[PDB]
Design a protein around this motif. Structure first.
Motif, short mmCIF file in Angstrom:
data_model
loop_
_atom_site.label_atom_id
_atom_site.label_comp_id
_atom_site.label_asym_id
_atom_site.label_seq_id
_atom_site.Cartn_x
_atom_site.Cartn_y
_atom_site.Cartn_z
N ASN B 179 46.41 -6.20 118.86
CA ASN B 179 47.81 -6.45 118.52
C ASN B 179 48.27 -7.84 118.92
OD1 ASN B 179 47.98 -3.79 117.56
ND2 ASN B 179 48.60 -3.01 119.58
N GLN B 180 47.66 -8.43 119.95
CA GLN B 180 48.11 -9.72 120.45
C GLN B 180 46.94 -10.65 120.78
OE1 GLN B 180 50.41 -8.89 123.97
NE2 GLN B 180 48.63 -8.21 125.15
N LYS B 212 47.61 -14.33 119.62
CA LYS B 212 48.37 -14.56 118.40
C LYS B 212 49.86 -14.52 118.73
CE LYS B 212 46.45 -11.12 116.27
NZ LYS B 212 46.13 -10.10 115.24
N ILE B 213 50.56 -15.60 118.41
CA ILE B 213 51.98 -15.69 118.67
C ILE B 213 52.74 -15.11 117.48
CG2 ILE B 213 52.43 -17.95 117.65
CD1 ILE B 213 54.17 -18.56 120.10
N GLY B 214 53.98 -14.71 117.73
CA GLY B 214 54.81 -14.10 116.71
C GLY B 214 55.59 -12.93 117.25
N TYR B 215 55.00 -12.19 118.19
CA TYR B 215 55.74 -11.15 118.88
C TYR B 215 56.73 -11.74 119.87
CZ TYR B 215 56.74 -7.46 122.24
OH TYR B 215 57.37 -6.58 123.10
N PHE B 216 56.30 -12.77 120.60
CA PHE B 216 57.19 -13.42 121.56
C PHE B 216 58.22 -14.29 120.86
CE2 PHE B 216 52.89 -12.95 123.23
CZ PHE B 216 53.12 -12.08 124.28
N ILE B 218 59.69 -13.41 118.06
CA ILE B 218 60.72 -12.44 117.69
C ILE B 218 61.37 -11.81 118.91
CG2 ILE B 218 61.15 -10.29 116.47
CD1 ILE B 218 58.66 -11.06 114.71
N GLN B 219 60.71 -11.85 120.06
CA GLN B 219 61.18 -11.16 121.26
C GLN B 219 61.87 -12.08 122.25
OE1 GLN B 219 61.17 -8.11 121.06
NE2 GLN B 219 61.15 -7.08 123.05
N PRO B 223 65.78 -15.17 120.41
CA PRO B 223 67.03 -14.90 121.15
C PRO B 223 67.46 -16.05 122.03
CG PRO B 223 65.59 -12.99 121.22
CD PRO B 223 64.79 -14.09 120.59
N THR D 46 51.51 2.95 119.29
CA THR D 46 51.23 1.85 120.21
C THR D 46 49.73 1.68 120.42
OG1 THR D 46 51.43 3.31 122.13
CG2 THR D 46 53.43 2.20 121.35
N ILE D 261 65.78 -6.43 120.69
CA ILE D 261 64.86 -6.26 121.81
C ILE D 261 64.58 -4.78 122.04
CG2 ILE D 261 64.48 -6.76 124.24
CD1 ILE D 261 64.51 -9.22 122.39
N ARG D 264 62.23 -3.01 119.29
CA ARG D 264 60.80 -3.31 119.33
C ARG D 264 60.11 -2.79 120.58
NH1 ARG D 264 58.36 -8.29 116.33
NH2 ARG D 264 56.96 -6.49 116.09
N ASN D 265 60.86 -2.30 121.57
CA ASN D 265 60.23 -1.75 122.76
C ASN D 265 59.36 -0.55 122.42
OD1 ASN D 265 61.71 -3.72 124.04
ND2 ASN D 265 62.69 -2.34 125.51
N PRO D 268 55.00 -0.87 118.34
CA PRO D 268 53.85 -1.62 118.88
C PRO D 268 54.08 -3.12 118.78
CG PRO D 268 53.11 0.13 117.43
CD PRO D 268 54.59 0.03 117.25
N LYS D 269 53.51 -3.84 119.75
CA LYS D 269 53.70 -5.29 119.84
C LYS D 269 52.82 -5.99 118.80
CE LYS D 269 54.72 -4.98 124.77
NZ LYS D 269 54.45 -5.55 126.12
N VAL D 270 53.21 -5.80 117.54
CA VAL D 270 52.52 -6.41 116.41
C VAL D 270 53.08 -7.82 116.20
CG1 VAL D 270 52.14 -4.16 115.38
CG2 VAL D 270 54.13 -5.51 114.70
N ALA D 271 52.19 -8.76 115.89
CA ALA D 271 52.57 -10.16 115.71
C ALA D 271 52.91 -10.47 114.26
CB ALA D 271 51.45 -11.06 116.22
N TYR D 272 53.81 -9.69 113.68
CA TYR D 272 54.33 -9.98 112.35
C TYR D 272 55.64 -9.22 112.16
CZ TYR D 272 51.80 -5.62 111.42
OH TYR D 272 51.31 -4.34 111.48
N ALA D 273 56.41 -9.65 111.17
CA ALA D 273 57.72 -9.09 110.92
C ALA D 273 57.61 -7.83 110.07
CB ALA D 273 58.62 -10.11 110.24
N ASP D 277 62.71 -5.42 111.04
CA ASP D 277 63.03 -6.72 111.61
C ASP D 277 63.87 -7.55 110.65
OD1 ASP D 277 61.54 -6.01 113.85
OD2 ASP D 277 59.70 -6.90 113.05
#
Ligand SMILES: CCOC(=O)c1ncn2c1CN(C)C(=O)c1cc(N=[N+]=[N-])ccc1-2
Ligand SMILES: CCOC(=O)c1ncn2c1CN(C)C(=O)c1cc(N=[N+]=[N-])ccc1-2
Ligand SMILES: CCOC(=O)c1ncn2c1CN(C)C(=O)c1cc(N=[N+]=[N-])ccc1-2
Ligand SMILES: CCOC(=O)c1ncn2c1CN(C)C(=O)c1cc(N=[N+]=[N-])ccc1-2
Ligand SMILES: CCOC(=O)c1ncn2c1CN(C)C(=O)c1cc(N=[N+]=[N-])ccc1-2
Ligand SMILES: *[C@@H]1O[C@H](CO)[C@@H](O)[C@H](O)[C@H]1NC(C)=O
Ligand SMILES: *[C@@H]1O[C@H](CO)[C@@H](O)[C@H](O)[C@H]1NC(C)=O
Ligand SMILES: *[C@@H]1O[C@H](CO)[C@@H](O)[C@H](O)[C@H]1NC(C)=O
Ligand SMILES: *[C@@H]1O[C@H](CO)[C@@H](O)[C@H](O)[C@H]1NC(C)=O
Ligand SMILES: *[C@@H]1O[C@H](CO)[C@@H](O)[C@H](O)[C@H]1NC(C)=O
Lengths: 336, 336, 336, 336, 336
Positions: B179-180, B212-216, B218-219, B223, D46, D261, D264-265, D268-273, D277
């Motif tokens: 996932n990351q 892989k960035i993209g979750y942070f 958006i997280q 913000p 997850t 925030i 998305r908790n 799953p911490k997926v790196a895409y929209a 979203d």
């Protein structure tokens, strides 16, 4: 050339009773123990326990295993471990310890001509480490590791560290990696404990832990410090702006309230005040005191405006000084 | 036609000692190892561990198992695995490894006429992967996998990868799904480690991970970025609207404070600043600085109104430019 | 000199049936039990269970094991435990109990000439401790520990504590360490329970727990107390400052609302009100009442301004007095 | 009349080698497999895994078990399962599978006169189900279940579904109960995979999952939708009420920030929209845009008041229309 | 006098086949089952499962165990359980069941002269309890417990409850203690299920659960009720106090939004609306409607001030009445 080894093993096991310790009724069995810490697992402050993975080695003398052959040593595996006698070593403070079984039970057995036996085992011990969190996070911990015989008292089986303390216990360079602790060093010792079942020699290894600060600075201290500075900004606003200064005091006071709750969520639910708690309490006083100053200033802004302005002007200097002075005393007191 | 196979198995096990390695006292046992990663399990950053499911295969030569028969191979199952000698391979960095037992113990054993033995096993290894989260989330990790003999030193048992590195370790296309993290590739190597129990050859496999960035984004980043933009809106409001601009500064400052706390909850409690922390810290400065600008502007709005208006007007341009300039430096610095 | 011991063990096991209790058809087997609590594990209030690690010792007489030899005692290990008869002791309230197996099964067996047998075992019992959280956090708990024979009724096997109650159960000084409880003392007793399978003697050990306050003071009471004081500050502000006093009432009321939710998150989801709940409820009334006072004051500030000022002035004295008076009654009522 | 059965079992096991598959060196062993899903356990998004409890049945022919007797069938239990040969079936994608042992190992063995063998087993498989959460929560998932022989290639053991696909796999009516998924149906198939150890036939069962919406509507969409409506209320307030409209914009913008925030908790911490979203992002734009409209309106409320009123009046119509129009496109796009 | 018992046990096991059920080929084996629930463990609503600890007893007739001796009964332990035939009873809905092994496997075996056998076992069953949370928290649940033979169909082994339903299943007074459920009673029954492997008699025990309210009243209803009352206070403030009334509406609306999110965090993620959800939705409407009333009132406070005052005055009466009226209907509807 391989059948010779088979005969030797059969001969040693012929007439061998694994239920009797070597030297029974003749002498005291001496066991030499050495430890290698492959990895110092995480230290759970909430559960007051730490996890450690070690290569536990035990050496003793067994005259029943003497043999003569071309090879002076007999490397083996876990298969023969159950066929001979081994010490019933156990960890007194070990809450839950399990062995590694994959790919094969990680046990080694070596036998020499004189009968000396080497039996090493890989373990993952989850022991209990009581901690006094009075100076937290500027606290040092000494997590011990106690082990010894379960059934054989001091008069039958005795454990002694091999060589010096440094060689007895070894920690891998990459093993001693913790997120919130520094492994300063290790110490070893021995003692005798008197019990209803007899005296037992206890082998103890102590690990010195120095908690590393920096996570709480980014998590607790800095938000508290900046929140206090935020409250002091209200002193630079005009008195007539009652709503504007009220927002500063109310928001800052509640912000500190939630920080105290959030900070202790990770900390163990200990029924006493820590050093961090005092820092938060003082910060709460500063933000709360600032709101009281505004309320007092706004209360007399009409009857005696002259004094109200002086108090507001003076507070702009006193509050930053006291907060800065407190930090120097606080940090110096604990960082020493 | 089936009784012939039964006789062959009985003959091989007749006079066979599984406690002695093949070629003992005559040569060094050579083991060829190949791995197939069925699935690269999750990487737990908090616990600095990763889970991997593999088909671990070991091949070696045993002259004691030579046989003659119509069939050149003897496919079998786990039943005969315990009856013969197998290497005591173990994972040095494996914190907890367990086998699969359903429906049947997932083990295969194949024997050829010459005595070559193939013994493959399915495992789920939970190894430790230390990480340096200084460039997080723009960090690359190299999680290793070390294994070797537990009881047989380099002078008795030697492990060597079969064929080249690419064929030695294979990862399924669907297995490498995280996932990351991106599984860039794999590398293998060998080394000798000197220990108190002797020298042991270590077979190591390194997995290259590119977070892989993209979750942070958006997280955390978005913000924070939008919160900074929200604060700058206060510069477009009139100075006399003291309460209105106070709400902007107070709310934005506290919003950034909670974002920093929330962001690090998922991140491991590392005692050092990461790249994301610096980004949050700078964003906190911008929102905090905007509030200070209003306080300074509101402080001199009476004595020297002319300068107060110019500062407010100028801040409308400087703040967006600096924040945009910082991002270009920040992203370019780490995305390179 | 060691072969003599081997003969004795072989003789005792010759013609020995482990499926039959000693004295069967002749007398009632008497078992003397003593316990040593190595560590009193955590008490999970949510799951109404506690964990305890003990050295459970059982002593009984077996004439079939009588022997003559130079040594009056035969220290042994777990190997011979399965070969002889042992009581089927079990914990009636034990939800999940597991033994310690590393490094060796922590069991000891000792046999004397007369046939007396000592069999001690290390256990980690996770028993259930029902609690009445009506006076929480000023509540005292009595967690029991019940054990006895599973298959042998009172007419066949009887358990009796050895010596007095103090010697029967012993708790280590460092073992009795809990984060939110004080181990005041221990008591033991015996009773007979009538069941469809027959009468069974039950050996019970009760641990007296006195919850230690101080975590909830720092977590719940203090934020509630300071929040109430924060609300009362509104009484010192001018009536015309409608927005300023509205922020005080709204923020304080919501602050208490979230504190009640947060406080019960850790507490078990019990369907009744605790002492802490009443304290929070009263605090919620004070903050809510203060807002109502402002609304009533602001409602009549025009028609009858004279009474509005008197109410606001009077509230500055009544509210602090009542809140202080309530605490003295509350704390004295429960701290007694 | 019972001794006859004992003789039959003894005769079959006489000279029977369980290490050799039936028909070895003569034919290819054909195994017929049928499955009954007692309960389709939870699907962990997850961890990208699902749990399933099944009654796994395997049927094959073994001429070595032929017998003659009054009874045409020999119902049995797990006791004889280990004494005969059974396929080494394993689940390729099964991360962790464990059997049920209480009260007795849930295994059945039945043998007919011709030698046909029925061997069914109860299992709880925790397999991995990769998911593409691009249309989440309007996403459909196809969780597979792959199993086959571990040691016997396609040339020795072949698995085939019995009867049609519908009869091969059966799901209990109450078993297919998930909190956030609909079990639309099941499909089965077969394939051959080429591996370094040989070709193996793979039996695959696919479960079609249709995520049921309604939890996210109550959890994410509705709060976002109502928050946007709340922001639009500011357009109905007078421009001079700067503080009042500022509270609307600031509170709504931050409310949407925390919703993103919080949402998305659980995800799953997926790196895409995902689709959710985008919905949140658009809602954030509407609330943020409303605040910008007020800032722009309040910026020109003095120089050109006429245009400021028109913009505020127009925004009362445009914003509700666009938000409503977006939802129709959004819902229609994904609900189709 | 003890050797006689040894001979009896040896004689019974002589020529005894444990793989064959008693009365095979002659009659149908009848098993009488009784249950004693030591403790009704927690009911996990999220996982739709409950944990129960029971003393499961099975009685049957075995003519092969007939014996003659001075004692009419032969109390025993788990040692002889494996040597004889026992039913392969299993729990159809049991997701995960494990036995208790400490201090000794908690199993009892008793044999009478006629051959009657009593075999009781202690179990901890984690079964699945589907629930329809449409009336939550005013919902009643019926958690079943199904068990029967795994390999022996209805034509070979039959289970029947002993005596009446009340005696068949017994629950300890202290065992039936749940934090959020009342154990109203228990019911038992029998049924036949047709399966591909044959007909099997199913023994079912249903536990009636009545969820106890009071935790959600203190957690969800009261904060929602007081929040609505807080919003109505705005009606008592002057219209010109735009900022003051805006804070009431905005804060209350967001407070209800977070309560809905917080409330469902503990509740299972069910994709339908519960009774509590409707209560929250109505409360959200009241607070939201109050804000709309202020916006409408503030919109016409200039053009037609007379009507604005009347609406504000009227709202002070209508809103409390409707909210109170709704509660009476809501509580009466579900509390009946
Ligand atoms: C209650 C009667 O005793 C027991 O049942 C018992 N069982 C074991 N052990 C004991 C005695 N005791 C309290 C131990 O702390 C103990 C310590 C030892 N030393 N080491 N390492 C070795 C054995 C020990
Ligand atoms: C403390 C005395 O040693 C031991 O007790 C011991 N036991 C096992 N092993 C050791 C030695 N050691 C520290 C190991 O890291 C070790 C590494 C190996 N190589 N591989 N793969 C193989 C075996 C090893
Ligand atoms: C339902 C038929 O009974 C049983 O199946 C059963 N099985 C065991 N036991 C029982 C009986 N019973 C309810 C027990 O609470 C029980 C208590 C004892 N005493 N202790 N310590 C010892 C044994 C007990
Ligand atoms: C690395 C050398 O191989 C192995 O060690 C190995 N061990 C087992 N298996 C393999 C081969 N392989 C990658 C498998 O995916 C495999 C698939 C099968 N089919 N099914 N169901 C059956 C067996 C398989
Ligand atoms: C798929 C072929 O069947 C099987 O493999 C299988 N294996 C066991 N069982 C079955 C059949 N079945 C679906 C069962 O629900 C089953 C129920 C029973 N009754 N009880 N209690 C007893 C046994 C049962
Ligand atoms: C423990 O007992 C032995 C008995 O020989 C003694 O030599 C040793 O000094 C004792 N250790 C301590 C710490 O008292
Ligand atoms: C390890 O030892 C062997 C001994 O034959 C040697 O051939 C090999 O080069 C060594 N490997 C390394 C990395 O030094
Ligand atoms: C239990 O039964 C025995 C029978 O001898 C009796 O002596 C004892 O007093 C009984 N205990 C209690 C508490 O009644
Ligand atoms: C797998 O191999 C067998 C060999 O007989 C063949 O019959 C079958 O069609 C193959 N299956 C597929 C999907 O190719
Ligand atoms: C189940 O089958 C048996 C066969 O004898 C019958 O007596 C019994 O009534 C059946 N039970 C039900 C519920 O139909």
């Amino acid at each position: 050339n391989i059948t010779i080894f088979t005969r030797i093993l059969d001969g040693l096991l012929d007439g061998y009773d694994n239920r009797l310790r070597p030297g029974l009724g003749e002498r005291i069995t001496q066991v030499r123990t050495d430890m290698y810490v492959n990895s110092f697992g995480p230290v759970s402050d909430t559960e007051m326990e730490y996890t450690i993975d070690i290569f536990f080695a035990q050496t003793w003398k067994d005259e029943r295993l003497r043999f003569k052959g071309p090879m002076q040593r007999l490397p083996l595996n876990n298969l023969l471990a159950s066929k001979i006698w081994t010490p019933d070593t156990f960890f007194h403070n070990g809450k839950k310890s399990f062995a590694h079984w994959m790919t094969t039970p990680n046990r080694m057995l070596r036998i020499w001509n004189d009968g000396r036996v080497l039996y090493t085992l890989r373990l993952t011990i989850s022991a209990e480490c009581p901690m006094d969190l009075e100076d937290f996070p500027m606290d040092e911990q000494n997590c011990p590791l106690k082990f010894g015989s379960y059934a054989y008292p001091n008069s039958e089986v005795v454990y002694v560290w091999t060589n010096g303390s440094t060689k007895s216990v070894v920690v891998a360079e990459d093993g001693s990696r913790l997120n919130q602790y520094h492994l300063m060093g290790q110490t070893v010792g021995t003692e005798n404990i008197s019990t209803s079942t007899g005296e037992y020699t206890i082998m103890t290894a102590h690990f010195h832990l120095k908690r590393k600060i920096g996570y709480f600075v980014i998590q607790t201290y800095l938000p508290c410090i900046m929140t206090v500075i935020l409250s002091q900004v209200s002193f630079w606003l005009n008195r007539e702006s009652v709503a504007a200064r009220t927002v500063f005091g109310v928001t800052t006071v509640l912000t500190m309230t939630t920080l105290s709750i959030s900070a202790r969520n990770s900390l163990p639910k200990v029924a006493y005040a820590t050093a961090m708690d005092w820092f938060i309490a003082v910060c709460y006083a500063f933000v709360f005191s600032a709101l009281l100053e505004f309320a007092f200033v706004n209360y007399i802004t009409k009857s005696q405006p002259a004094r109200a302005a002086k108090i507001d002007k003076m507070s702009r200097i006193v509050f930053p000084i006291l907060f800065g002075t407190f930090n120097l005393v606080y940090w110096a007191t604990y960082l020493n």
